[PDB]
Design an enzyme around this catalytic site. Structure first.
Site, PDB file in Angstrom:
ATOM      1  CG  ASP A 129      -5.782  -8.638  23.240  1.00  0.00           C
ATOM      2  OD1 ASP A 129      -4.948  -8.326  22.352  1.00  0.00           O
ATOM      3  OD2 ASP A 129      -5.503  -8.601  24.465  1.00  0.00           O
ATOM      4  CD  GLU A 181      -5.392 -12.820  23.397  1.00  0.00           C
ATOM      5  OE1 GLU A 181      -5.868 -13.122  24.511  1.00  0.00           O
ATOM      6  OE2 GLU A 181      -4.423 -12.038  23.276  1.00  0.00           O
ATOM      7  CG  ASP A 188       0.472 -12.152  19.747  1.00  0.00           C
ATOM      8  OD1 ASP A 188      -0.673 -11.740  20.036  1.00  0.00           O
ATOM      9  OD2 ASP A 188       1.463 -11.943  20.492  1.00  0.00           O
ATOM     10  CG  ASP A 227       3.136  -8.354  19.988  1.00  0.00           C
ATOM     11  OD1 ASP A 227       3.113  -9.076  21.021  1.00  0.00           O
ATOM     12  OD2 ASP A 227       4.108  -7.652  19.617  1.00  0.00           O
ATOM     13  CD  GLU A 259       4.380 -13.037  22.271  1.00  0.00           C
ATOM     14  OE1 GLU A 259       5.029 -13.696  23.104  1.00  0.00           O
ATOM     15  OE2 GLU A 259       3.637 -12.082  22.621  1.00  0.00           O
TER      16      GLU A 259
HETATM   17 MG    MG Z   1      -1.031 -10.666  21.819  1.00  0.00          MG
HETATM   18 MG    MG Z   2      -2.058 -10.118  25.472  1.00  0.00          MG
HETATM   19 MG    MG Z   3       1.989 -10.782  22.081  1.00  0.00          MG
END
Ligand code: MG
Ligand code: MG
Ligand code: MG
Ligand code: CL
Ligand code: CL
Ligand code: MG
Ligand code: MG
Ligand code: MG
Ligand code: MG
Ligand code: MG
Ligand code: MG
Ligand code: MG
Ligand code: MG
Ligand code: MG
Lengths: 326, 326, 326, 326
Positions: free
Chosen positions: D65, D89, D109, D112, D271
């Site tokens: 991440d 994030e 994102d 994911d 998303e």
């Molecule tokens: Mg993510």
């Molecule tokens: Mg996450």
């Molecule tokens: Mg995600």
């Protein structure tokens, strides 16, 4: 491609007459794979430039020298197949720890052509494997066999592609790294050097320091006395590269004695004997000038010798010059 | 590593003062990437040996020559940035189809060092980019500019690692292929050649055919008259490799005129001018023996010239030998 | 990294108490490496879509199914270690040719999760190795041992990364493909499944066709009667992926009998027994609903069975539902 | 292969009617390449397990991440093409530094399917690009456009192979990473989703918490009232994987509101809108249950929404259930 002849499989299927040797080899190949990968992203992984020490032969060591040395040592020791290693990079012989002790002795140059890393010329890894025959405690003396007693030997060339040349006594076989499959695959079986070649290879910048025999032979390559074309000159400066070109194109490679290096510069155990072994297996010749390199009894692990190898007729003609001048 | 300086990004961030040039380059780099990958598994994809024809310069073509040529042509044409290409492998200039026509002219050697493919020595791709300045129909004549008019030029070296040297007029930058990331990343910015080097590089097997100026200069490298050490000899036989070693180590590279090749052997447009451009950008010199290579008005796309390049003081000393002998 | 624990080395160093098994494995791993590489460029090498036939289990075969099958067969046969292979893709048992005959029997699924290739979900290769114990001519009957008699078993998962799970009787070890080094390296040793998990996994679209025991158990996962959180649902549709998630996260995986598949759908020999073996080795359970899968005497090479495996407490609770309903 | 249709080239050749967009994309693709490589050796580079913090949406962050987030941020900023980024994030919008300011807004994102990294299930990177239209200082408010105003959007799927789905307004195109060539190459152009599918996809473990509309629709998938076969269930648990399978196989994917998540769980900006955009471009539908996702005016960067997308007829039938129940 659904039936690939990998190194391992070819060695297994020809050797149908010893596994422990093949396990030692698989460890070497793992090291070679690791080295090849490091070489190939050397500039990005900030791996050029000095290491900050000199080896017992007078060579300013690189960061790769150190890295590839541990790879080879750790890998070889872990095979449970070795008792004694000799390395260009270590002062003394490395005795394997008792709990991992096997029967084989390996002499290796973990990275050859170090002065050529920065300019991305071909470089390599050189190795010779012997069988411990003496009964005493594993020592440096077990590594002092004549190259005539080699059980398997070869080199990796990290060039435009990665290649292993290997012999276990029945000729030379060429393998290549398949990046897709992460393994070595056979590309040429039982390679034989041309009886006579058209290329001469030496650092000609030592001309001022050659002995008469060398000076004379070179004159014959550039100024033949029989109307034939002069030989072409090639000199990469990495012994593996020059020696490999010699094997597949034909010709002669020379690193003989000179005033600056009275007994030659290349190391007998882990440079000269392994390539001498390959060339002899390929129908070529490899001499110090007075005897075949593989017949020299080594007296010290880091001993140097003159090396003149390649197509038989070319080496024969060089030895004439030696006789005609002594 | 979370902030990698890719080629594209470095060119974009320095060039902040033309995109169409950067799109042409991105196509070239794609070709170079494809070539590099093919080179690296050449033996396995059964790609050594002949192709079955001769080019208009007298060179026995390899299977790679053909492959890398289409890669470069298709890629360059597809950029929508070219009007005229010249290639070592094609007899005439390739005019871009009108619907893809752009403003740039590219001269390239799609694979250099072909006689060295089989022995896995370093090999490369060489290119020079010009701007079409004339008003007439795109023809071969647009490719006949002086190398002094180059807009960008460089080479790829497929060696132990894959490297691009590139200049767009503001010095030389070195990039390297990151296999993990499939892109070129900057490793050295604004490289400058040593004022004076310690290595001389030429096929010395033509000694019998050198003119007096060359014979004399070489004598000074091996037999200096001032107590200094003689220069080391290196000659890979692939011009990219030799030229790149010259750039990073210093020294001199020579492929001059000789009896067999009265006007030199290397091709002006797609070998000599691109490397001449790199070396000049790096503070070095590149001469035919009578003028700077980049100042030669080409009169024919496949024209040859003598090439002597490298560290300025070394080339200067070579030009003395020329003056002292004419 | 100068001391990498490769698969081979870990197997050699733990097994210090049989090589022939380790040679069989090295051949399997070569096949797995080749498959992994093909999978990873499957769309580019135009490898999706049908093959143009049905297997003896009713499965529409893909182009990969065929490719990965020959890879496995050729590789395994070439090890000099096998006598009998069973494959999902071949109608009858493949007897090894006499001149390559060894002592081992392998049952394998050369590519599992075929309906999930096109959408790039995880897919895998599944294998179980037995020792031939009977004295007669090698036949299909040698492949009909109880999974209780497995000598080594595991799977490759071609997911976001390539992983092998392997057991030779002393627990489960996880290895991963290192792309740099082209080998499998140990990442987790002696993995043990959670006693109880939080994830249930089955094709719930067969709800209409479940037997009462299954219907009831699922109700307890989604509608617990004790205030606890309902379990999460996950179902990739590739048994390797679902089974691997079960092993590392905990929980239960179900492919039980239903009206459409009265005796289950998964194949006993080359799907169920290998994963049953892994899960049992990891402290989990794997049942048909009436007995442990590894205790079923197979009567036909392509025989199907119900499979319910995973965290012991979860499977125990499922078996309750079976008892409570028969 | 001598004429490869790379991403860049296809975008350039279709877009012949904006470069600055194509430079933003090339930066994204570089990030995606870097991420893909990290994912693929994640276990070896010791990259599993926690990072040691929670994001503003309640998600326990992984080491990847963090890594993939900086890659995307650094790459995007460096394009000279952005003014405002939103990331899963980061708490607030990241305003580009003035000296690198461009016209585009990106919502992304960076990785994911984080709960599925350890079990090597497919995972991905999701992105939507807008044009800044307002005149004020770059702020979070520029990132609050309706997905109806997307200029380009897509996702990378790091599965059995690495794939990008991309749309710039003229349909969906699928690209795949060629490991040999380090670039994305077109594999499917103008993909269109099946009008009606045979697969339903949701975390069924929330059954206890579905609203009546969802409960009813699912009943119709498993227990049809018209003699047709029940739909198959699939649920990977990584939205990219499930959404991609939906696109190429057909069917429906559901992450609707439930008692535990009263307004849905998936994030609107980075998303839902990007995948909604892809599915609509492919002839499918993507709804919150009351309106098309792309028509929702976002009021906060980390806002959540219900998501139901896929084959038009399947979504239509789901919306019936909503009408029939409100
Ligand atoms: Mg993510
Ligand atoms: Mg996450
Ligand atoms: Mg995600
Ligand atoms: Cl070289
Ligand atoms: Cl998956
Ligand atoms: Mg050294
Ligand atoms: Mg060395
Ligand atoms: Mg050496
Ligand atoms: Mg040529
Ligand atoms: Mg050429
Ligand atoms: Mg050339
Ligand atoms: Mg099948
Ligand atoms: Mg299968
Ligand atoms: Mg299967």
């Amino acid at each position: 491609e659904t039936d690939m002849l990998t190194l391992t499989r070819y060695v297994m299927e020809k050797g149908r007459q010893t596994g422990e040797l093949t396990q030692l080899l698989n460890s070497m190949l793992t090291a070679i794979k690791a080295i090849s990968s490091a070489v190939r992203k050397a500039g990005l992984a900030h791996l050029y430039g000095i290491a900050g020490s000199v080896n017992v032969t007078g060579d300013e060591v690189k960061k790769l020298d150190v890295l590839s040395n541990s790879l080879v040592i750790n890998m070889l020791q872990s095979s449970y197949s070795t008792c004694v290693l000799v390395s260009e990079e270590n002062k003394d012989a490395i005795i394997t720890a008792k709990e991992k002790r096997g029967k084989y002795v390996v002499c290796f140059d973990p990275l050859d052509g170090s002065s050529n890393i920065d300019c991305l010329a071909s470089i390599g890894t050189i190795f010779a494997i012997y069988r411990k025959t003496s009964e005493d405690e594993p020592s440096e003396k077990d590594a002092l066999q004549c190259g005539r007693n080699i059980v398997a030997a070869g080199y990796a060339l990290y060039g435009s592609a990665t290649l292993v040349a290997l012999s276990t006594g029945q000729g030379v076989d060429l393998f290549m790294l398949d990046p897709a499959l992460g393994e070595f695959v056979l590309v040429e079986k039982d390679v034989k050097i041309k009886k006579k070649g058209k290329i001469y290879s030496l650092n000609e910048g030592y001309a001022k320091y050659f002995d008469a025999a060398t000076t004379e032979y070179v004159q014959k390559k550039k100024f033949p006395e029989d109307g034939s074309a002069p030989y072409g000159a090639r000199y990469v400066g990495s012994m593996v590269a020059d020696v490999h070109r010699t094997l597949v194109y034909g010709g002669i490679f020379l690193y003989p004695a000179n005033q600056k290096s009275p007994k030659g510069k290349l190391r007998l155990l882990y440079e000269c004997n392994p390539v001498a072994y390959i060339i002899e297996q390929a129908g070529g010749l490899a001499t110090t000038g007075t005897q075949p390199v593989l017949d020299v009894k080594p007296e010290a692990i880091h001993q140097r010798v003159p090396l003149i190898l390649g197509s038989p007729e070319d080496v024969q003609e060089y030895l004439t010059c030696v006789q005609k001048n002594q």
